[PDB]
Amino acid sequence: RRLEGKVAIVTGGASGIGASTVRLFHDHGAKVVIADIQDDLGQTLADRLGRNISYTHCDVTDEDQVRALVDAAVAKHGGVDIMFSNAGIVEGPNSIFDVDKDELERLMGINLVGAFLAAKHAARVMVPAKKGCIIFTASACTEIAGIAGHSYTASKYGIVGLMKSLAVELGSHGIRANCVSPFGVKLMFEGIMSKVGNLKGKILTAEDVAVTVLYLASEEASYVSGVNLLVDGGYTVVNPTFINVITAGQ
Amino acid sequence: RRLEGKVAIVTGGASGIGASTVRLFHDHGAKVVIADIQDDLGQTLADRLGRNISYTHCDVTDEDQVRALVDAAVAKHGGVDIMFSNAGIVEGPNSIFDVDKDELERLMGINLVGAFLAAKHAARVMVPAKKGCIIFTASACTEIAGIAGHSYTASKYGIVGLMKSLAVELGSHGIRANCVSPFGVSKLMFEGIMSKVGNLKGKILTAEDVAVTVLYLASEEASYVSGVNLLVDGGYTVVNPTFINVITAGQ
Amino acid sequence: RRLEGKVAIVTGGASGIGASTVRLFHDHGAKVVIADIQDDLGQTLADRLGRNISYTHCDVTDEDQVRALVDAAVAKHGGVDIMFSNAGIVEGPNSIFDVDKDELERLMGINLVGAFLAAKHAARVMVPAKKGCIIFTASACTEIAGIAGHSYTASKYGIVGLMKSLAVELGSHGIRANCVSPFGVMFEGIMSKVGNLKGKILTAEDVAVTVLYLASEEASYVSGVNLLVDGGYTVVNPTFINVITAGQ
Amino acid sequence: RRLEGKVAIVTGGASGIGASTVRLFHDHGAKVVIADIQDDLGQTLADRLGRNISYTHCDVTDEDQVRALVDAAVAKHGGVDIMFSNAGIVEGPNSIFDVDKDELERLMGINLVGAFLAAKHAARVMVPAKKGCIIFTASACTEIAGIAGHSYTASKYGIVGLMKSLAVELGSHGIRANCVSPFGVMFEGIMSKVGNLKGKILTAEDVAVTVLYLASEEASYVSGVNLLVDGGYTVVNPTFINVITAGQ
């Protein structure tokens, strides 16, 4: 139990990466507040896990709801040690011709502006306590192109920049900020990832990402801050096209 | 004249970096369309420079005006070779406590969403021509913290990411995308600050210096340069001098 | 115990970061071979920790000793799961005028060429097993200037590049490669004034914990990563903010 | 003529990127000293270009020759404004199993240690003049894996690190340091298939133009930059899109 007594907020934690982090955060002894718009999954998950895991409906585009979410966790557990800003919507690779302004602004509002508000209100409770961790979910697209849509990539770069500015401002008060950038998080999707991944014999699951958030959130990373930690099996470090052409013709 | 016959759109080009790029773009023989909301500066500048430089009012938060701006340059000059997406608003270092959602969304709309629309409509005219370059103004803050506000930094990172996705998608059609990230662009009060702050000494960054770097990336001297966020910061972003200052102070 | 059954080689592990990783690697159940030229510390440490920790003299500039080190761990424990290439020598900030070619080549040989040989011989035993982890100790200087000597910085960049090429070549066989870049591992008051993150001093024990992460199956999909342990130091140039605040 | 009156040293400038930079440097009015071990190409090129281009035999692994090269250009033209450290040897993609220690040390000595000596002796003449530019040839491999050999990649990362430390130390005296990292400088059909940016083949002449930019006063505030000339190759891993597309 690597977070006994700690208090964690997980936005976007009723499915996906957020839901496995909630389960993991729970196995290691944290108190966790689930914040999501998926009210049915969110409440069912919070009820299955026990008393230290409660659900609160929060649209992270609405600052009133975000402020209420942080205020209520501080009313209930006395403070916020971990903010995991995981809410967002995804976009596979597309064209700049596909980009619609209304949809771009809708995505920016959930992915990027939701992270500002999560950060702004966690910092508001952590700074006077002089401790805390903020973790954002970015994406491997922040390091290599060709795996995500244009709008999604821009919003995820913005999160990295916000995370690094937070790391400076909040470092003065003992507070850490970091990002985790996964890559390729049913059956039709395994075989492609087996073809696409740089590291072989290993498929990335949501549970694996949750483990990396556990590291960054814990006191095993007590001096880690400002880091966008990639979980991509090396995918981002290689362009294999050149080697494929030398090998194909020879 | 390193761009003879080329056609350039400069959004946010009536003041600052945009205005010096317009002048430079003009000295080197480009046709340039100025796109700005500063209608008085924009039109005066376009009138002083001559026939190849015309002004068009464009709010880059409004896709209709952006679409009209690109359509009209293609109506008058036959195509668009260079899009310089330079429109944006600035914000010095601040606190996450200072961030107001309405102001964050207003800044995101001008800095980031304006760049998407500039890109989307330039690409629309360049792809069938199989040539062109898109240049964005990012900022040295995309490489080092502590020189810009939180909202501004996030929007400028988004531009880098957009620029790199564009470099992939549009490379297939011959089109280049790049960013230029300046640092350092009461006039004297701010100059003595930069003399104390800059890593490279004996040299003050001006808007004219940035315009020269955009000239490079826009020209055929960078005909194979794409996907690059080119810093113009005298090295500021590569050093944290705190450790050396403390060893020297106590010794 | 997050590595029960695993076999680890730690070069340069009789002092410093290497020695705390050895102790940590041991608490979590690994078999560890210590490889160092500090024969007195190395053997004392190996004797204090128990049967699963043994010392072997290895100069990592000598490929024959490196080859013997890997061959003997494979003779003794059946394979090598973790190679922690930690051997190296340090240089504080200096001048390009200070750089002597002989000293430069001596440093390149220990820091950089020692890492090639460590990698080359670990890969030789791991590839046919289709598993393993290689971790290098780089430095926060690979991300920001002004905290290390010129020769030292170049050798530590070379290690990052070697680590990323390895991550590609060896990923095809299931093998991971990563780096850990610490910062600031009399001296406390320096780091208390210098660090970006306040109220926390970096120790060797903290780095050992980060190597534990990268070495373990909690990073089973982490590869090609130069993981900084610097409290944010590398992400900020605070000069501009200091001048605005000083004059105002 | 963008460098009228300037004085440039080009190591490794009798062939390849170095030779086209020499020609370009010459067209734009610089005085250039060619430094190479290819004595036949070097002298023929220097004789073809005129009086402002002279050749000097210099092995950049030998500090005595490097020191003589810089001392003689300062004796002959009064100072050194541009040092283009371009000497080096190449390695295509290979295996960590292919790496031989003697070969690794030979490559480190030419690529990396040659750059230290070039830098150290240019700085020695530029610092008292309070102006100058040092440019290194790195490689696109410093940004993406899979296009160069292991030894070559490590040596080219070391150059980036050396360049960034130099940018800090020498900025205090007005001196700039930068790198240029080209990519893909039978073989053109390969590059037509491999390049991200289409309808354009990278030549040595294109790189020379980028060195011209960094060397000139059009980059008078550019320092610490590893400028890639790769048509975007380093920013994309197209594998995922290729596997989706073949199915869709």
Residue numbers in the entry:
A (entry chain D): 8 to 192, 204 to 268
B (entry chain C): 8 to 192, 203 to 268
C (entry chain A), D (entry chain B): 8 to 192, 206 to 268
Sentences copied from the publication:
BDHs belong to the family of short-chain dehydrogenase–reductases. The members of this enzyme class have a TGXXX(AG)XG NAD+-binding motif and a YXXXK active-site motif and form dimers or tetramers. Some BDHs have a high twofold stereoselectivity in the conversion of chiral monoterpenoids by preferring one of the two substrate enantiomers and forming a stereocenter by asymmetric reduction of the diastereotopic keto group. Here, we report the determination of the structures of two stereoselective dehydrogenases, SrBDH1 and SoBDH2, by single-particle cryoEM.
To explore the general applicability of cryoEM to the high-resolution structural analysis of small plant enzymes, we also subjected SrBDH1 to cryoEM-based structure analysis. The SrBDH1 preparation yielded a single peak in a SEC-MALS analysis, consistent with a tetramer in solution, in agreement with its crystal structure. By picking 1 635 690 particle images from 1666 micrographs, we generated a data set of similar size to that for SoBDH2. Following the same data-processing routine as used for SoBDH2 yielded a final SrBDH1 reconstruction at 1.88 Å resolution. Almost the entire protein chain could be traced in the cryoEM map, which is reflected by an exceptional atom inclusion level at the moderate contour level of 0.3 for 97% of all backbone atoms and 93% of all non-H atoms. In addition to the first eight residues and the very C-terminal residue, the region from Leu193 to Leu205 is not defined in the density due to the missing NAD+ cofactor, as in SoBDH2. The SrBDH1 model derived from the cryoEM map is virtually identical to the apo-state crystal structure (r.m.s.d. of 0.6 Å for 982 pairs of Cα atoms). At 1.88 Å resolution we could identify 399 water molecules, which uniformly cover the protein surface or are bound in cavities within the protein core. We observed 34 side chains with a double conformation, corresponding to about 3.5% of all residues. To our surprise, we could not observe NAD+ in the cryoEM structure of SrBDH1, although the protein samples used for crystallization and cryoEM were identical. Furthermore, in the SrBDH1 structure the αFG helix, upstream of the unresolved loop region, is stabilized by the C-terminal αH helix via hydrophobic contacts.
